Short mmCIF file of all heavy atoms in Angstrom, two decimals:
data_model
loop_
_atom_site.label_atom_id
_atom_site.label_comp_id
_atom_site.label_asym_id
_atom_site.label_seq_id
_atom_site.Cartn_x
_atom_site.Cartn_y
_atom_site.Cartn_z
N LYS R 754 -6.11 -37.79 -23.69
CA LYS R 754 -5.26 -38.56 -24.59
C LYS R 754 -4.10 -37.78 -25.20
O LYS R 754 -3.34 -38.35 -25.97
CB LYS R 754 -6.08 -39.17 -25.73
CG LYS R 754 -7.33 -39.92 -25.30
CD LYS R 754 -7.00 -41.08 -24.36
CE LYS R 754 -8.00 -42.17 -24.51
NZ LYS R 754 -7.67 -43.25 -23.53
N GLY R 755 -3.97 -36.49 -24.89
CA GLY R 755 -2.87 -35.65 -25.42
C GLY R 755 -2.93 -35.32 -26.92
O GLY R 755 -2.16 -34.50 -27.40
N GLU R 756 -3.84 -35.96 -27.66
CA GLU R 756 -3.97 -35.69 -29.09
C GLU R 756 -5.30 -35.04 -29.38
O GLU R 756 -6.33 -35.61 -29.05
CB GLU R 756 -3.98 -37.00 -29.87
CG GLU R 756 -2.70 -37.78 -29.86
CD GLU R 756 -2.85 -39.06 -30.66
OE1 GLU R 756 -3.55 -38.99 -31.71
OE2 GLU R 756 -2.30 -40.11 -30.22
N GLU R 757 -5.28 -33.84 -29.95
CA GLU R 757 -6.47 -33.17 -30.51
C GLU R 757 -7.61 -32.95 -29.54
O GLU R 757 -8.77 -32.98 -29.93
CB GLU R 757 -7.00 -33.98 -31.70
CG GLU R 757 -6.14 -33.92 -32.96
CD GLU R 757 -6.50 -32.76 -33.85
OE1 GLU R 757 -7.59 -32.16 -33.67
OE2 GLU R 757 -5.69 -32.44 -34.74
N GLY R 758 -7.30 -32.74 -28.26
CA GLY R 758 -8.36 -32.56 -27.27
C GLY R 758 -9.13 -33.82 -26.88
O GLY R 758 -10.05 -33.76 -26.09
N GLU R 759 -8.73 -34.98 -27.42
CA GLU R 759 -9.42 -36.23 -27.08
C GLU R 759 -9.44 -36.48 -25.59
O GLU R 759 -8.46 -36.23 -24.89
CB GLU R 759 -8.82 -37.45 -27.76
CG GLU R 759 -9.25 -37.66 -29.17
CD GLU R 759 -8.91 -39.07 -29.68
OE1 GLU R 759 -9.33 -40.06 -29.02
OE2 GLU R 759 -8.22 -39.19 -30.73
N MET R 760 -10.57 -36.96 -25.12
CA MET R 760 -10.72 -37.33 -23.74
C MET R 760 -11.69 -38.49 -23.66
O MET R 760 -12.70 -38.51 -24.38
CB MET R 760 -11.21 -36.15 -22.91
CG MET R 760 -10.94 -36.30 -21.41
SD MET R 760 -11.40 -34.86 -20.41
CE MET R 760 -10.01 -33.75 -20.70
N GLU R 761 -11.34 -39.45 -22.79
CA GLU R 761 -12.14 -40.65 -22.50
C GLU R 761 -12.54 -40.65 -21.01
O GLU R 761 -11.68 -40.58 -20.10
CB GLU R 761 -11.34 -41.90 -22.88
CG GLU R 761 -12.08 -43.25 -22.67
CD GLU R 761 -11.41 -44.42 -23.41
OE1 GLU R 761 -10.79 -44.21 -24.49
OE2 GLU R 761 -11.53 -45.57 -22.94
N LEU R 762 -13.84 -40.76 -20.76
CA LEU R 762 -14.36 -40.66 -19.38
C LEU R 762 -15.15 -41.90 -18.96
O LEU R 762 -15.93 -42.44 -19.76
CB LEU R 762 -15.22 -39.41 -19.20
CG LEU R 762 -14.52 -38.05 -19.41
CD1 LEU R 762 -14.60 -37.55 -20.86
CD2 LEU R 762 -15.15 -37.03 -18.48
N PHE R 763 -14.92 -42.32 -17.72
CA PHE R 763 -15.71 -43.39 -17.09
C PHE R 763 -16.55 -42.74 -16.02
O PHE R 763 -16.03 -42.05 -15.17
CB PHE R 763 -14.78 -44.44 -16.47
CG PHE R 763 -13.85 -45.05 -17.47
CD1 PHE R 763 -12.56 -44.54 -17.65
CD2 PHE R 763 -14.27 -46.10 -18.29
CE1 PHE R 763 -11.70 -45.09 -18.63
CE2 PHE R 763 -13.41 -46.67 -19.24
CZ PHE R 763 -12.12 -46.16 -19.42
N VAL R 764 -17.86 -42.89 -16.11
CA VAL R 764 -18.70 -42.11 -15.22
C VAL R 764 -19.95 -42.83 -14.80
O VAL R 764 -20.52 -43.66 -15.53
CB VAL R 764 -18.91 -40.62 -15.70
CG1 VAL R 764 -18.22 -40.32 -17.00
CG2 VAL R 764 -20.33 -40.16 -15.69
N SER R 765 -20.32 -42.56 -13.55
CA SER R 765 -21.50 -43.12 -12.95
C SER R 765 -22.64 -42.18 -13.35
O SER R 765 -23.02 -41.30 -12.60
CB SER R 765 -21.31 -43.20 -11.42
OG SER R 765 -22.33 -43.99 -10.81
N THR R 766 -23.18 -42.36 -14.55
CA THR R 766 -24.26 -41.50 -15.00
C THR R 766 -25.34 -42.25 -15.78
O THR R 766 -25.08 -43.30 -16.39
CB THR R 766 -23.75 -40.32 -15.88
OG1 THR R 766 -24.85 -39.50 -16.27
CG2 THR R 766 -22.99 -40.82 -17.13
N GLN R 767 -26.54 -41.70 -15.71
CA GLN R 767 -27.66 -42.14 -16.50
C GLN R 767 -27.69 -41.44 -17.86
O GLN R 767 -28.53 -41.79 -18.70
CB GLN R 767 -28.97 -41.81 -15.76
CG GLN R 767 -29.13 -42.43 -14.36
CD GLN R 767 -30.36 -41.90 -13.63
OE1 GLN R 767 -30.30 -41.48 -12.46
NE2 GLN R 767 -31.49 -41.92 -14.32
N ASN R 768 -26.80 -40.48 -18.08
CA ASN R 768 -26.87 -39.58 -19.25
C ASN R 768 -25.50 -39.34 -19.87
O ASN R 768 -24.91 -38.26 -19.75
CB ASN R 768 -27.46 -38.24 -18.80
CG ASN R 768 -28.03 -37.40 -19.95
OD1 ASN R 768 -27.74 -37.59 -21.13
ND2 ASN R 768 -28.85 -36.42 -19.58
N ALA R 769 -24.98 -40.36 -20.53
CA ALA R 769 -23.68 -40.23 -21.19
C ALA R 769 -23.69 -39.15 -22.29
O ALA R 769 -22.65 -38.52 -22.53
CB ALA R 769 -23.22 -41.56 -21.74
N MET R 770 -24.83 -38.92 -22.94
CA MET R 770 -24.90 -37.87 -23.97
C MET R 770 -24.65 -36.47 -23.41
O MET R 770 -23.76 -35.78 -23.88
CB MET R 770 -26.21 -37.91 -24.79
CG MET R 770 -26.40 -36.61 -25.62
SD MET R 770 -28.01 -36.45 -26.37
CE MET R 770 -27.83 -34.87 -27.22
N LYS R 771 -25.44 -36.05 -22.43
CA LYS R 771 -25.22 -34.75 -21.80
C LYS R 771 -23.87 -34.69 -21.11
O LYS R 771 -23.25 -33.62 -21.10
CB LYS R 771 -26.33 -34.39 -20.81
CG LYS R 771 -27.66 -34.04 -21.47
CD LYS R 771 -27.52 -32.92 -22.50
CE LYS R 771 -28.82 -32.75 -23.30
NZ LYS R 771 -28.64 -31.77 -24.40
N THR R 772 -23.40 -35.80 -20.53
CA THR R 772 -22.03 -35.82 -20.04
C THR R 772 -21.04 -35.44 -21.15
O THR R 772 -20.20 -34.56 -20.97
CB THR R 772 -21.58 -37.19 -19.47
OG1 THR R 772 -22.52 -37.63 -18.49
CG2 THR R 772 -20.22 -37.04 -18.83
N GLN R 773 -21.12 -36.13 -22.27
CA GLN R 773 -20.25 -35.86 -23.44
C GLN R 773 -20.31 -34.38 -23.93
O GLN R 773 -19.27 -33.76 -24.19
CB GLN R 773 -20.60 -36.85 -24.55
CG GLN R 773 -19.73 -36.79 -25.81
CD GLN R 773 -20.33 -37.61 -26.94
OE1 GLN R 773 -21.55 -37.82 -26.97
NE2 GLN R 773 -19.49 -38.10 -27.87
N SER R 774 -21.52 -33.83 -24.06
CA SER R 774 -21.73 -32.44 -24.53
C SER R 774 -21.22 -31.39 -23.58
O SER R 774 -20.62 -30.39 -24.01
CB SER R 774 -23.22 -32.13 -24.65
OG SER R 774 -23.76 -33.01 -25.56
N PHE R 775 -21.52 -31.57 -22.31
CA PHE R 775 -21.16 -30.58 -21.31
C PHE R 775 -19.65 -30.51 -21.24
O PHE R 775 -19.09 -29.41 -21.19
CB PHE R 775 -21.77 -30.88 -19.92
CG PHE R 775 -23.21 -30.49 -19.79
CD1 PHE R 775 -23.99 -30.19 -20.90
CD2 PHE R 775 -23.82 -30.47 -18.53
CE1 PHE R 775 -25.35 -29.86 -20.76
CE2 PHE R 775 -25.17 -30.14 -18.38
CZ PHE R 775 -25.94 -29.84 -19.50
N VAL R 776 -19.00 -31.67 -21.28
CA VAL R 776 -17.52 -31.70 -21.26
C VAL R 776 -16.93 -31.06 -22.53
O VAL R 776 -15.99 -30.28 -22.45
CB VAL R 776 -16.97 -33.13 -21.07
CG1 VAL R 776 -15.48 -33.15 -21.31
CG2 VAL R 776 -17.32 -33.64 -19.69
N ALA R 777 -17.48 -31.38 -23.68
CA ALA R 777 -17.06 -30.73 -24.94
C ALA R 777 -17.21 -29.20 -24.91
O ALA R 777 -16.27 -28.47 -25.26
CB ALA R 777 -17.81 -31.33 -26.13
N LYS R 778 -18.35 -28.72 -24.44
CA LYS R 778 -18.61 -27.29 -24.32
C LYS R 778 -17.65 -26.60 -23.37
O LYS R 778 -17.20 -25.49 -23.66
CB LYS R 778 -20.03 -27.06 -23.84
CG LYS R 778 -20.59 -25.63 -24.09
CD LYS R 778 -21.86 -25.50 -23.26
CE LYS R 778 -22.81 -24.40 -23.74
NZ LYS R 778 -22.26 -23.07 -23.43
N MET R 779 -17.36 -27.23 -22.23
CA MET R 779 -16.44 -26.62 -21.29
C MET R 779 -15.02 -26.53 -21.87
O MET R 779 -14.35 -25.52 -21.73
CB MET R 779 -16.48 -27.29 -19.91
CG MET R 779 -15.35 -28.26 -19.66
SD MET R 779 -13.82 -27.45 -19.15
CE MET R 779 -14.62 -26.33 -18.05
N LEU R 780 -14.59 -27.59 -22.55
CA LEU R 780 -13.26 -27.61 -23.15
C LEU R 780 -13.14 -26.74 -24.41
O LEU R 780 -12.03 -26.38 -24.79
CB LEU R 780 -12.86 -29.05 -23.48
CG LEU R 780 -12.66 -29.97 -22.28
CD1 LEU R 780 -12.48 -31.42 -22.72
CD2 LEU R 780 -11.47 -29.47 -21.44
N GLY R 781 -14.26 -26.45 -25.06
CA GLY R 781 -14.25 -25.69 -26.32
C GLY R 781 -13.71 -26.55 -27.44
O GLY R 781 -12.86 -26.13 -28.21
N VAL R 782 -14.27 -27.77 -27.52
CA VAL R 782 -13.79 -28.82 -28.41
C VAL R 782 -15.01 -29.51 -29.04
O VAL R 782 -16.09 -29.52 -28.45
CB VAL R 782 -12.92 -29.76 -27.54
CG1 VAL R 782 -13.61 -31.10 -27.25
CG2 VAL R 782 -11.55 -29.92 -28.11
N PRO R 783 -14.90 -30.03 -30.29
CA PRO R 783 -16.11 -30.71 -30.81
C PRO R 783 -16.48 -31.98 -30.04
O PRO R 783 -15.62 -32.67 -29.47
CB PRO R 783 -15.74 -31.06 -32.25
CG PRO R 783 -14.62 -30.14 -32.61
CD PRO R 783 -13.90 -29.78 -31.34
N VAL R 784 -17.76 -32.30 -30.05
CA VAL R 784 -18.28 -33.46 -29.34
C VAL R 784 -17.58 -34.79 -29.75
O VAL R 784 -17.29 -35.65 -28.90
CB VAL R 784 -19.83 -33.51 -29.44
CG1 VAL R 784 -20.39 -34.75 -28.81
CG2 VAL R 784 -20.44 -32.26 -28.80
N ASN R 785 -17.26 -34.92 -31.04
CA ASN R 785 -16.60 -36.13 -31.57
C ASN R 785 -15.25 -36.47 -30.92
O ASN R 785 -14.69 -37.55 -31.14
CB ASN R 785 -16.50 -36.09 -33.12
CG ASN R 785 -15.61 -34.98 -33.66
OD1 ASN R 785 -14.86 -34.32 -32.92
ND2 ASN R 785 -15.66 -34.80 -34.98
N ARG R 786 -14.76 -35.55 -30.09
CA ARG R 786 -13.50 -35.72 -29.37
C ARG R 786 -13.67 -36.45 -28.03
O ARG R 786 -12.71 -36.99 -27.48
CB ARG R 786 -12.86 -34.33 -29.13
CG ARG R 786 -12.46 -33.58 -30.40
CD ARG R 786 -11.53 -34.43 -31.29
NE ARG R 786 -10.77 -33.63 -32.26
CZ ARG R 786 -11.29 -33.03 -33.34
NH1 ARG R 786 -12.59 -33.10 -33.62
NH2 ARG R 786 -10.50 -32.34 -34.15
N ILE R 787 -14.89 -36.45 -27.50
CA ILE R 787 -15.15 -36.86 -26.13
C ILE R 787 -15.86 -38.21 -26.13
O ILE R 787 -16.87 -38.42 -26.81
CB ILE R 787 -15.96 -35.76 -25.36
CG1 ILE R 787 -15.23 -34.40 -25.41
CG2 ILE R 787 -16.26 -36.17 -23.88
CD1 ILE R 787 -13.77 -34.39 -24.83
N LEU R 788 -15.29 -39.16 -25.40
CA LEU R 788 -15.88 -40.48 -25.31
C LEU R 788 -16.28 -40.78 -23.87
O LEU R 788 -15.45 -40.66 -22.98
CB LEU R 788 -14.87 -41.50 -25.82
CG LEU R 788 -15.18 -42.96 -25.52
CD1 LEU R 788 -16.51 -43.36 -26.17
CD2 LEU R 788 -14.01 -43.86 -25.96
N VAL R 789 -17.55 -41.15 -23.65
CA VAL R 789 -18.07 -41.48 -22.30
C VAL R 789 -18.48 -42.96 -22.22
O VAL R 789 -19.25 -43.48 -23.05
CB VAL R 789 -19.27 -40.55 -21.84
CG1 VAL R 789 -19.75 -40.90 -20.41
CG2 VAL R 789 -18.88 -39.08 -21.92
N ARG R 790 -17.96 -43.63 -21.20
CA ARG R 790 -18.21 -45.06 -21.01
C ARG R 790 -18.89 -45.27 -19.68
O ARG R 790 -18.47 -44.73 -18.67
CB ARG R 790 -16.90 -45.84 -21.05
CG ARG R 790 -16.15 -45.67 -22.38
CD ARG R 790 -14.82 -46.39 -22.38
NE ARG R 790 -14.98 -47.84 -22.27
CZ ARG R 790 -14.01 -48.71 -22.54
NH1 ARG R 790 -12.82 -48.28 -22.94
NH2 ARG R 790 -14.23 -50.00 -22.42
N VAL R 791 -19.99 -46.03 -19.71
CA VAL R 791 -20.77 -46.32 -18.53
C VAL R 791 -21.03 -47.81 -18.44
O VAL R 791 -21.82 -48.36 -19.23
CB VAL R 791 -22.12 -45.59 -18.49
CG1 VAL R 791 -22.84 -45.94 -17.20
CG2 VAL R 791 -21.93 -44.10 -18.57
N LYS R 792 -20.38 -48.45 -17.49
CA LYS R 792 -20.60 -49.86 -17.30
C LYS R 792 -21.83 -50.07 -16.42
O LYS R 792 -22.81 -50.69 -16.84
CB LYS R 792 -19.33 -50.50 -16.70
CG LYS R 792 -19.53 -51.92 -16.21
CD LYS R 792 -19.09 -52.89 -17.25
CE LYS R 792 -19.25 -54.31 -16.75
NZ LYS R 792 -18.92 -55.25 -17.84
N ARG R 793 -21.78 -49.57 -15.19
CA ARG R 793 -22.90 -49.71 -14.25
C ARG R 793 -22.88 -48.61 -13.20
O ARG R 793 -21.83 -47.98 -12.95
CB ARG R 793 -22.93 -51.10 -13.59
CG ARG R 793 -21.79 -51.39 -12.60
CD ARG R 793 -22.01 -52.71 -11.82
NE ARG R 793 -22.22 -53.86 -12.70
CZ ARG R 793 -21.24 -54.44 -13.40
NH1 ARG R 793 -19.97 -53.98 -13.31
NH2 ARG R 793 -21.52 -55.49 -14.17
N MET R 794 -24.03 -48.39 -12.59
CA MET R 794 -24.15 -47.43 -11.53
C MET R 794 -24.60 -48.20 -10.33
O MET R 794 -25.44 -49.11 -10.46
CB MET R 794 -25.21 -46.39 -11.88
CG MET R 794 -24.73 -45.28 -12.78
SD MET R 794 -26.15 -44.36 -13.42
CE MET R 794 -26.75 -45.48 -14.70
N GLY R 795 -24.07 -47.82 -9.16
CA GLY R 795 -24.63 -48.32 -7.92
C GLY R 795 -25.85 -47.52 -7.46
O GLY R 795 -25.83 -46.89 -6.42
N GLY R 796 -26.93 -47.57 -8.23
CA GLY R 796 -28.07 -46.66 -8.03
C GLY R 796 -27.93 -45.37 -8.85
O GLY R 796 -26.81 -44.87 -9.05
N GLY R 797 -29.07 -44.85 -9.32
CA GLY R 797 -29.18 -43.56 -10.04
C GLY R 797 -30.44 -42.84 -9.57
O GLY R 797 -30.37 -41.73 -9.01
N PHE R 798 -31.59 -43.47 -9.81
CA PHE R 798 -32.90 -43.00 -9.31
C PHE R 798 -33.26 -41.60 -9.79
O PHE R 798 -34.09 -40.92 -9.16
CB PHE R 798 -32.99 -43.07 -7.77
CG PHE R 798 -32.56 -44.41 -7.16
CD1 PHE R 798 -31.42 -44.47 -6.34
CD2 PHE R 798 -33.32 -45.57 -7.34
CE1 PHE R 798 -31.02 -45.69 -5.73
CE2 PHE R 798 -32.96 -46.80 -6.74
CZ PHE R 798 -31.81 -46.86 -5.93
N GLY R 799 -32.65 -41.16 -10.89
CA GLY R 799 -32.93 -39.83 -11.41
C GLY R 799 -31.86 -38.85 -10.99
O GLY R 799 -31.66 -37.83 -11.64
N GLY R 800 -31.13 -39.18 -9.92
CA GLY R 800 -30.10 -38.28 -9.41
C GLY R 800 -28.85 -38.18 -10.26
O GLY R 800 -28.06 -37.26 -10.08
#
């Protein structure tokens, strides 16, 4: 988003929380900056 490290992600995941954290940690930015949106997955099965 160009402001304050904000980032919005659309992802095929069963784990939006760990997605959000891992991305925050890699960027060196607080978690409150990262937004993860998950509508549906075409299969997950633990993978």
Side-chain angles (χ1 to χ4, degrees):
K754 310 301 209 183
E756 293 180 38
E757 288 272 345
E759 279 195 55
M760 200 176 280
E761 182 164 330
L762 298 91
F763 302 94
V764 2
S765 192
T766 181
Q767 301 172 229
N768 199 342
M770 166 190 180
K771 289 305 171 187
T772 307
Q773 184 192 25
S774 300
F775 281 14
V776 170
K778 198 193 201 288
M779 101 81 42
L780 294 171
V782 107
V784 176
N785 65 12
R786 296 306 199 289
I787 305 302
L788 167 61
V789 182
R790 300 177 64 165
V791 181
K792 169 97 178 175
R793 69 171 55 74
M794 278 167 283
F798 310 114

